[PDB]
């Protein structure tokens, strides 16, 4: 066995995948077999989700996370997000599950049967980690693949059925996007938006014309930079900036993935556009806004004048002003006055929540939505007891938004730790002291004392 | 070489588990404490002492099982199996919480056996007995919490019950009734525990990151040999790193390792003293000058007055079920509540 | 050498008494800004309407507080997650009423403490050390992000972040238990095992090394003088310490490798505190501790209480009393 023990490889069993750093044939097989694990799970989970799925229950009541991802794409859903057909979920699960036997085969093949190194067999599929031009070429190859993937979403939205649109007028529906936002002041304007409250950076994207036109821009940028990296070598400022080794490139992707996981955690928590509340449940802000709506509606039905009702503190019990003066829901939900959702936006005038609209124009579908969202707030226990920590056992609910945000916080945190681990190790390995201090030339011993 | 010296020979044989003279006390007392806990949490109820299910046999999980304390009407009774409460009936003894005092007393004498074992082995191998001295802190904590605390109170009922959620209740009881977070002896305990965990993390990372390259492997554990005279890591490099990062750094390895003894041991001893005060309800509950000001100025609010409102909530909401010997009927209108909730 | 080369040589200089470095050019002004504003606001800030309900909480020493009760109070619930610098306020008086200092302190501190972590990598790189001290510091740094930033983001308001004060810390803890049952969350339990274990292993490693110190001194002197700074021989007998501890428990429960020992000393508290940080950070999105309220039911259907139901009774009392004027509707949803 070449490199499959600690004496020959330098790495113990518990760091045994580091024995593959300079074995590109087996290292390719590790990646292809692991790609098959991802695709296996995407297929197996979907079939599990579909086999447990009740179409007359909402998706968010059923512990589903992958069916809502398919439904948001426009597949299998009708107006308001009701499931009109379970066959697209069955196709997406089956095709992933079959394809993972394919990726599993070539992963197993390259990792046990194929050549341990690809360099002798092929100059095109071989690489040195230190060959900067080969590194940018493969980077360019994968950038093109990702840009085409972003245009696949555009093609779904424009030419192959559309996407589910929670903001579609007259209630949410699958809608073909015809005029995506191509204006770069809007698309790149989200990049300069503050991440703080009321702004929210890219998480604030609130319409599918911005989502589709952004993916047009991303798909063309990734194809352009793909072609750019195939046809260039890193400039001297980048050569003197970075560490050029496999562990270093891993660490850059680790920091990149950690940053993206934190972003997705905030996406699923706050955004009800690309994570529609009919599929994922109400957001945290949404349900708190929906409780204030529920008790405004009930008490105003009893005869209360909700605009003039003073709470215990002297703020309005139902309605109050935000610090810039917009009319907002009172109580603790004053913090969530930046929430925007299709059940609430009909009540909102130019200066905020309109008292005349609130008195007259609250439809029964809004009252049903407010009560349903208030009672499906993303709060629950680890054993999936719905509601506050003091609630009794009965309701079996943890919102998908809570599952998706918490999982991706954990993953993004540990990926930041992995970034720090591998980036520090790659620097020490390139500078040559990752195995410790040379006793015969210890650096501090030739530095002057601090005092 | 009489019978005593022959017995002393056998007790101190180099075997897989050392026995020693201390093992006569340690081994049966520790095994009965552990075995008593596993027995009670698997099979024994708390229905007659607390009105609680507390075993796996009743339906509880690992987080909710406990060997619960005896009923408050037991007082500080030793609850011996042959004592006047059980009168020899094992089944009644289990139902009266006799397993709690079984575990607490065998556990106490077992801990005594463990420190004697630390002293005995240290004397036989020829090392200094600092491990026995550091173990006085867990002994001070067990004695103050499980023995001195209920002895100052009405009965063994108010000691911690041996169980995970039962211990969590004990934490919440000490907040709501004793305001134990406000106590400077607990605060000194927190600093000792979190300081010791800091010292554990910081010393282990520093050694592992100032290691000398003593081998060619990238996995560096093999480059230590247990018989080497030389240091495996650079004290000089460690000292320069921390002097520049943090301003101060250890320069004496012996003082460093003493300070690692001192910090969590002193912290736990400090926390034991505060619990001894709470045995008599000698709490650091209030700040009088804030209470005088808050009572006359209804706009004066601090986080301290906010915490006391939480404490009052804890007491009125938990006391009827937590203290079912008091027969508390608190009608719903007497319950302190905020608006809406 | 031009001025930029002379400047870069100074910044990354290993001969400075405290290492500056590139992370330090961010760490130094942000931490100074956070410290100065903290000391001023702790001494002299006026009361702060933390809950957005025109009910200002006095945090400073000059306004009644002592060291224990004092706090820099988290910013107003009316602000939420909105960025509130000084220049957003119409006056300094308004900024102080709404809890402006808190946002300034925590943002500067978290930026500076992140750069403290990078500075720990940076110096170890300059000194030729191995780089993973900063990974160990990521455990308390993540905890600080958890209570000051991640928990406010999930709950929608910096009013819910941990206050910068001793009693405010306890207020944060009690309310968190009321709403999340953190004691019943296994990530906090792993966190407790981290710090209890860390304190145990600190005392254990300290005592075992002190127990096995080689005799170099007389009775009339401190034993610490038996060690000289920078000496090459080890100052204790690790074989004697392993011989003791391997007989206290059993032989294979004791480390005979000091590198494996010291890695275990790093790994146990750090992983546990990492899990404690992920406890807070995932309870930020309301995935709470285990709920066994009314889990045990008799044959008829009577609830048989457990210790978990007793915890719930305490949690209810904290719940109904916290922020006693702030709730208008029957569910505390954030």
């Amino acid at each position: 066995a070449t490199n499959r023990d600690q004496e020959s490889s330098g790495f113990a069993w518990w760091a045994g995948n580091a024995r593959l750093i300079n074995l590109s044939g087996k290292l390719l097989g590790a990646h292809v077999a692991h790609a098959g694990l991802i695709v296996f799970w995407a297929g197996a989970m979907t079939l599990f989700e579909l086999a447990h799925f009740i179409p007359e229950k909402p998706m968010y009541e059923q512990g589903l996370i992958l069916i809502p991802h398919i439904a948001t794409l426009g597949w299998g859903v009708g107006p308001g997000g009701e499931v009109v057909d379970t066959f697209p979920f069955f196709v997406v699960g089956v095709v992933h599950l079959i394809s993972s036997a394919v990726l599993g085969f070539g992963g197993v093949y390259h990792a046990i049967r194929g050549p341990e190194t690809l360099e002798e067999y092929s100059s095109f599929f071989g690489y040195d980690w230190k060959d900067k031009n080969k590194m940018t070429t493969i980077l360019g190859f994968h950038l093109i693949v990702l840009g085409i993937g972003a245009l696949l979403l555009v093609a779904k939205a424009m030419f192959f059925g559309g996407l589910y649109d929670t903001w579609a007028p007259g209630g949410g529906d699958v809608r073909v996007i015809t005029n995506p936002t191509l204006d770069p002041r809007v698309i790149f304007g989200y990049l300069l938006k503050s991440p703080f409250g009321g702004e929210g950076w890219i998480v604030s994207v609130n319409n599918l014309e911005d989502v589709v036109g952004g993916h047009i821009w991303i798909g063309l940028i990734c194809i352009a930079g793909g072609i750019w990296h195939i046809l260039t070598t890193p400039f001297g400022w980048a050569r003197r900036a970075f560490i050029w080794s496999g562990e270093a490139y891993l660490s850059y992707s680790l920091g990149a993935l950690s940053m993206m996981g934190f972003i997705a955690t905030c996406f699923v928590w706050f955004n009800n556009t690309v994570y529609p509340s009919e599929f994922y449940g109400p957001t945290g802000p949404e349900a708190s806004q929906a409780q204030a709506m529920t008790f405004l509606i009930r008490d105003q039905k009893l005869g209360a004048n909700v605009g003039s009702a003073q709470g215990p503190t002297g703020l309005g019990k139902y309605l109050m002003r935000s610090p810039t003066g917009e009319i907002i829901f009172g109580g603790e939900t004053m913090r969530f006055w930046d929430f925007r959702g299709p059940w609430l936006e009909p009540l909102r005038g130019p200066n905020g929540l309109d008292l005349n609209k609130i008195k007259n124009d609250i439809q029964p579908w809004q009252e049903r939505r407010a009560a349903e969202y208030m009672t499906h707030a993303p709060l629950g226990s680890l054993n999936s007891v719905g509601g506050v920590a003091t609630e009794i056992n009965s309701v079996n609910f943890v919102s998908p938004r809570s599952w998706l945000a918490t999982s991706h916080f954990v993953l993004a945190f540990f990926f930041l730790v992995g970034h720090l681990w591998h980036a520090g190790r790659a620097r020490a390995a390139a500078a040559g002291f990752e195995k410790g201090i040379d006793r015969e030339s210890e650096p501090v011993l030739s530095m002057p004392s601090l005092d | 070489r009489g019978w005593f010296d022959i017995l002393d020979d056998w007790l101190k044989r180099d075997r897989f588990v050392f026995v020693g003279w201390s093992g006569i006390l340690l081994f049966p007392c520790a095994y009965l404490a552990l075995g008593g806990w596993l027995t009670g949490t698997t099979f024994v109820t708390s229905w007659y002492t607390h009105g609680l299910a507390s075993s796996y046999l009743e339906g509880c999980n690992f987080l909710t099982v406990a060997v619960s304390t005896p009923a408050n009407s037991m007082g500080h009774s030793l609850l011996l199996l042959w004592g006047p409460e059980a009168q020899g009936d094992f089944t009644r003894w289990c139902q009266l919480g006799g397993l709690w005092t079984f575990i607490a007393l065998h556990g106490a004498f077992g801990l005594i056996g463990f420190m004697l074992r630390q002293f005995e082995i240290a004397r036989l191998v020829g090392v200094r007995p600092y491990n026995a001295i550091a173990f006085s802190a867990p002994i001070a904590v067990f004695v103050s919490v499980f023995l001195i605390y209920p002895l100052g109170q009405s009965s063994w009922f108010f000691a911690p019950s041996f169980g995970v959620a039962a211990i969590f209740r004990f934490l919440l009881f000490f907040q709501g009734f004793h305001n134990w977070t406000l106590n400077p002896f607990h605060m000194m305990g927190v600093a000792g525990v979190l300081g010791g965990a800091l010292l554990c993390a910081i010393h282990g990372a520093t050694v592992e990151n100032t290691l000398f390259q003593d081998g060619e492997g990238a996995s560096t554990f093999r480059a230590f040999n247990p018989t080497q005279a030389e240091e495996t890591y650079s004290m000089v490099t460690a000292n320069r790193f921390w002097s520049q990062i943090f301003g101060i750094a250890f320069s004496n390895k012996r003082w460093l390792h003493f300070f690692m003894l001192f910090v969590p041991v002193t912290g736990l001893w400090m926390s034991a003293i505060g619990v001894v005060g709470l045995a008599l309800n000698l709490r650091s509950y209030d700040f009088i000058s804030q209470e005088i000001r808050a009572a006359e100025d209804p706009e004066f609010e601090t986080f301290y007055t906010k915490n006391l409102l939480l404490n009052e909530g804890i007491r009125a909401w938990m006391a009827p079920q937590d203290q079912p010997h008091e027969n508390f009927v608190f009608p719903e209108e007497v319950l302190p509540r905020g608006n809406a909730l | 050498a031009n001025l930029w080369e002379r400047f870069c040589n100074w910044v990354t200089s290993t001969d400075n008494r405290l290492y500056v470095g590139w992370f330090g050019v961010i760490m130094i002004p942000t931490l100074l800004a956070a410290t100065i504003c903290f000391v001023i606001a702790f001494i002299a800030a006026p009361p702060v309407d933390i809950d957005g309900i025109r009910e200002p909480v006095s945090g400073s020493l000059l306004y009644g507080n002592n060291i224990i009760t004092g706090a820099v109070v988290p910013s107003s619930n009316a602000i939420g997650l909105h960025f509130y610098p000084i220049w957003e306020a119409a006056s300094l008086d308004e900024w102080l009423y709404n809890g402006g200092p808190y946002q300034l302190i925590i943002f500067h501190f978290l930026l500076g403490a992140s750069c403290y972590m990078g500075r720990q990598w940076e110096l170890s790189y300059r000194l030729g050390m191995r780089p993973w001290i900063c990974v160990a510091y990521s455990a308390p740094l993540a905890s600080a992000f958890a209570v000051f930033l991640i928990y406010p983001i999930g709950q929608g308001s910096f009013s819910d972040g941990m206050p910068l004060g001793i009693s405010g810390t306890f207020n944060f803890m009690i309310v968190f238990q009321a709403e999340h049952n953190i004691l019943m969350h296994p990530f906090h339990q792993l966190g407790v095992a981290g710090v209890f274990g860390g304190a145990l292993f600190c005392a254990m490693h300290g005592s075992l090394v002190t127990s096995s110190l080689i005799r170099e001194t007389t009775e009339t002197e401190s034993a610490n003088y038996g060690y000289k700074f920078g000496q090459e021989e080890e100052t204790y007998n690790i074989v004697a310490a392993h011989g003791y501890f391997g007989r206290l428990i059993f032989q294979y429960a004791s480390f005979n490798n000091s590198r494996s020992l010291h890695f275990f000393l790093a790994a146990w508290p750090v992983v546990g505190v990492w899990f404690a940080a992920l406890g807070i950070s995932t309870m930020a999105f309301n995935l709470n501790g285990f709920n066994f309220n009314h889990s045990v039911i008799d044959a008829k259907g009577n609830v048989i209480n457990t210790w978990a139901d007793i915890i719930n009774r305490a949690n209810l009392g904290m719940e109904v009393m916290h922020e006693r004027n702030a709730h208008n509707f029957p569910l505390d949803l954030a």
Partner: peptide, 30 residues
């Protein structure tokens, strides 16, 4: 007097930090 006391002790601690860092007994390799 209370506020003066607490600030005084705090200022003495910060002064102690200054002397402990900049006027420490210098660690000497021997």
């Amino acid at each position: 007097m209370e506020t003066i006391t607490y600030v005084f002790i705090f200022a003495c601690i910060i002064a102690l930090f200054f002397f402990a860092i900049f006027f420490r007994e210098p660690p000497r390799i021997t």
